[PDB]
Amino acid sequence: AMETITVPTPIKQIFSDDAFAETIKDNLKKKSVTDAVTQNELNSIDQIIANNSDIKSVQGIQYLPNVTKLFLNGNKLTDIKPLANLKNLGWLFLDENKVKDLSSLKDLKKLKSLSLEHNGISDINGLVHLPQLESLYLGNNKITDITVLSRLTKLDTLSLEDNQISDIVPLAGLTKLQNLYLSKNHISDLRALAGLKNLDVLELFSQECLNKPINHQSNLVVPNTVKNTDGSLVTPEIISDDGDYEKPNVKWHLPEFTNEVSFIFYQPVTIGKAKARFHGRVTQPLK
Amino acid sequence: QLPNFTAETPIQNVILHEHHIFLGATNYIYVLNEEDLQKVAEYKTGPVLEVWKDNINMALVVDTYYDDQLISCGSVNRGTCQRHVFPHNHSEVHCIFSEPSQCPDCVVSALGAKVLSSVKDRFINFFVGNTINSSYPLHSISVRRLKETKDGFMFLTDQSYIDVLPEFRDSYPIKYVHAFESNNFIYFLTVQRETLDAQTFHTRIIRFCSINSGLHSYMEMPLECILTKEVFNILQAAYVSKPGAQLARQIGASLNDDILFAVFAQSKPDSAEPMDRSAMCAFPIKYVNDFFNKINVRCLQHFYGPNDEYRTEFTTALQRVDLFMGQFSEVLLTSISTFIKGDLTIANLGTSEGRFMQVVVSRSGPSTPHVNFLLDSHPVSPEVIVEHTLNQNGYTLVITGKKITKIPLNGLGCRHFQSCSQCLSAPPFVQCGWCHDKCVRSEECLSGTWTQQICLPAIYKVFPNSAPLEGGTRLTICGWDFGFRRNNKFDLKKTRVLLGNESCTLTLSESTMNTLKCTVGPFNMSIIISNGHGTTQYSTFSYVDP
Secondary structure (H helix, E strand, O other): OOOOOOOOEEHHHHOOOHHHHHHHHHHOOOOOOOOEEOHHHHHOOOEEEOOOOOOOOOOOHHHOOOOOEEEOOOOOOOOOHHHOOOOOOOEEEOOOOOOOOHHHHOOOOOOOEEEOOOOOOOOOHHHHHOOOOOEEEOOOOOOOOOHHHHOOOOOOEEEOOOOOOOOOHHHOOOOOOOEEEOOOOOOOEOHHHHHOOOOOEEEOOOEOOEOOOEOOOOOOEEEOOOEOOOOOEOOEEEEOOOOEEEOOEEEOOOOOOOOEEEEEEEEEEEEOOEEEEEEEEEEEEEO | OOOEEEOOOOEEEEEEEOOEEEEEEOOEEEEEEOOOOEEEEEEOOOOOOOOOOOOOOOEEEEEOOOOOEEEEEOOOOOOOEEEEEOOOOOOEEOOOOOOOOOOOOOOOOOOOEEEEEEEEOOEEEEEEEEOOOOOOOOOOEEEEEEOOOOOOEEOOOHHHEEOOOHHHOOOOOEEEEEEEEEOOEEEEEEEEEOOOOOOOEOOEEEEEOOOOOOOOOOEEEEEEEEEOOEEEOEEEEEEEEOOOHHHHHHHOOOOOOOEEEEEEEEEOOOOOOEEEEEEEEEEEHHHHHHHHOOOOEEOOHHHHOOOOOOOEEEOOOEEEEOOOOOOOOOOOEEEEEEEEEOOEEEEEEEEOOOOEEEEEOOOOOOOOOOOOOOOOOOOOOOOEEEEOOOOOOOEEEEEEOOEEEEEEOOOOOOOOOOOHHHHHHOOHHHOEEEOOOOEEEOOOOOOOOOEOOOOOOEEEEEEOOEOOOOOOOEEEEEEEOOOEEEOOEEEOOOOEEEEOOEEOEEOHHHOOOOEEEEEOOOOOOEEEEEOOOOEEEEEOOEOOOO
């Protein structure tokens, strides 16, 4: 413990956040936040459970070096620097916060589980510093580029549902994957997941592939770009505006001009031991 | 609890018309009052003779085109209809009946009928499907228009009807399950033989259009609801409406798009009777019409025989998959309605034993019915009404035998949920939360600990107690709330098991919100389980050595 208090101090003065202090108070069974705590008591803390507690700062968290379990979903945090030197951290859960500065975890080499769904996160390149991660929940954010996931090869469970990924090539080698969740993205081609022979649970529903605008024509023909794990086109389930599929082409008849056309696809897949349904909608803008 | 009305005899049909409910019952026609289902008026269609018979209602059709009135057809005098004219803002009952080669004023079969009604071009037209065997004409699929004289119907040409060859009249029959008009066509849903002299049975959908009394684009197509590969071949009920935004995106439908929610059952061997095994899927009309407008087909067999306007048929069934992923695999669903709240599509269903229940319908996966109870022991009828509008929260009229009940579209409170998870699985518009030891509404909370997001785990045993050193035995962890609530659903995504110092590899594909399965090895250890929200304990598992 580099960080530490030298003399008995009131909780209200260690932990600035009105709420977080009150969390400590309850944790160490104290009576009031005004009550004193010694560094001794601070070291006996292994886990903090404080979901939806209106926490806006975890200031004072640094004096808890033995803490290994953090449950902090449903708070207003946006700064995790107070966490950087808690060497013994393993599980850390921060959904529904606004922490986008994941570069603070660079030295949590014991961190195994990291949940950060619903934070507004675009850049996750900070993750390059935690190869040992076994479980990662990056669901519901603004992530487009997952190049960095190339290095987290110890993950047995990855979740990226509900973002903006269209390119999953960086996932090809993560063979140690068993649980993969990819719904609500822009995935067009599952050639990347070919080798994941360890999977047990996979999800791929409700994709949202969008195409670059095209001059509308009275007898439009849009090529099928959706591709299965082996590379084969996936026959469309339903086509908008009375369209047809004369493989590998999608065809429309547009006697009048319309902003766009589209087709839903549905393709049961199986990877390793996992049974999923690759499904979604391709959208074709027109001008 | 909720408004309900009991009649003297079975209820066959229900229509709603400007705040007044109309019941078609055996020997009576009731006029309840929408607000509280209170009986305001009635008419004894009575026991008619000809050697006493009962007058089972076969149709109700209101029409205010000419004058405000209600047409009704019974099953006694060769399916003859009668006018009921209202006296102003509201007894004066007429009748329709006039060289006997045909009989138009004979509309309805006592073997089962379905009646559509649409004023196409200055005249009211009745589109009717009749089941039948041997006896002197009623048509099986007819379109007889009513004259502005209002005293009788009239067929136009030979094409005004399509029937069954006398040689196959009794041999193989056709039950008309439901009928509806949409996209400028008319649709009939049937259960009939797969092929002439075939032992199994079908569900088909019929389409045609009308010109004077056209029936000009006639076509039959088979419909199958299969499970992931078991087939549910007998349509039991079928309702038609719009999809909620969620459901739509998944099936590629637009908000105004019409959809066919059909409940199928797995039939008995070489029969048309149903077993207690049910399924459901949705048929988008345009999707259907998409196939009706392409080109593998024979010539309507029960019409022509094995050998201008062609009446045709497809020889391979369109098929969709169960939206309940086998949820109702061992129950007989006998009634379906469909309404939208939010982005959600909710179906209120009915068992062959009297169980109304409401269920979020999604292409992603089944949800747990937020309503689920016992209307009377009598099976629920597929005859239903759904009045729901903005600034309002709507209701469903449901018929069980002699009884009809008005059931709210917001379900029936939270009090009935067994645990934090089910309680929190309920659809937003039910407004439930967990309050430590009970599920209930917001402002009715004891301790300030109401939550719509948080559930904590709890263990209640493990199998087995001990386990050999290196042995990767399967641990079965029995308990509660092992799952996490993300988006609006629960799953074991973030769920973890710890065997003191080492992790415990869960197989998720085999685990539930109540049961955990995972391989263990490589004492007297404590098992810690986290669902993502918090943790729980079990200090029993030992790494023994035989």
